[PDB]
Design a protein around this ligand. Sequence first.
Ligand code: HEM
Length: 399
Amino acid sequence: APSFPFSRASGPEPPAEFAKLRATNPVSQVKLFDGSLAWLVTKHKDVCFVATSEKLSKVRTRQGFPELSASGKQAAKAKPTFVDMDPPEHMHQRSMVEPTFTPEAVKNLQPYIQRTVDDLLEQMKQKGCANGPVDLVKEFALPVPSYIIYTLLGVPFNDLEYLTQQNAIRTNGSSTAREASAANQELLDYLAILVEQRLVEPKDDIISKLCTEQVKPGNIDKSDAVQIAFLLLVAGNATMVNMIALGVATLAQHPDQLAQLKANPSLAPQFVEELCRYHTASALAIKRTAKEDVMIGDKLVRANEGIIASNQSANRDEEVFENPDEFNMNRKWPPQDPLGFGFGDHRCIAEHLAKAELTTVFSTLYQKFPDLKVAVPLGKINYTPLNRDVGIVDLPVIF
Ligand code: HEM
């Protein structure tokens, strides 16, 4: 059994194993870091089954849960939030915070999302690039989702820049473990204080809603509110940063499609849909353990065996998406959903917010900077390490 996670084939490409497995062995066994074996599911139809089967569990203290690193094994000890829950506990807690992320709520947020993107673009303009390229990640891709989710949670404007840097330090590949855990503690301590404050005078933010509607009535206590706030911050922020940077790099690689976006910004929604299919930047979140024996394709998965469902592979599934390895914002879409945001009950709570952010970015960025160019040769883009989810560490641009 091959070791898993697989490495990406190159900077921007998924692992090569997935295409071979989809063709010859779509439900296979892989070896995890601790020597345990898990089942790996690679086809779109089987990923959807894994994501919805009531015979499968996300509870991480069940025997056989497929942890991918040693830190995940000890993270499993903590009291769980809804990301790690099965029905009916899952939707009991998830529903406490879902109101902010509904399509209607996200529509109402659209002026604020646009103003955030406008302000940060204008800041970048004023900084200019007269002394060399600027890092689109540091200057733009990192603060845009950070400022928005921090603001929704309830962080005041003056604290945004410090907390944005601390969260970036958490996931920066060159941070030492001491730097990353210090940044982590800094975030948790800040959130505990903000929870104490909002318990005394609620405002109009997510933490206030949790304090007023759940903590004070005693449905949860204040430490649960901190953990839930923390989950909403760290679950998707690094992914959002990567998607923004990957969209710029991808457009630099497909000049003809960038030219269409420049001439018709209203193509931004379709560009975003294809971006999220092609660059599946969160590819290791659909994990389960079997509560009962379950048959997947031609394989029997026994109770207490772990399953990893690759939505990355599913998003390149030839049986669903014609020419899946071509980036084509003008593709015709089949009836089946792309799985960039997962599937089923656990499907990303922030799918609509994330797409609204991405759509706002790519309908605005080239109207503001029509001559935006990646400043280094495209073969020299600093992608995330090949053993990690696809992403971009820094992206020098001029404009
Ligand atoms: C492009 C941006 C993003 C992508 C590609 C993405 C992707 C995903 C994926 C693949 C999952 C697993 C879903 C499943 O189990 O089927 C997920 C879950 C989740 N994501 Fe996102 N995400 C993004 C942005 C965000 C943001 C901005 C937030 C929070 C503000 C967020 C919060 C969550 C949470 C809380 C879950 C767990 C949901 C549950 O189990 O009920 N994500 N996301």
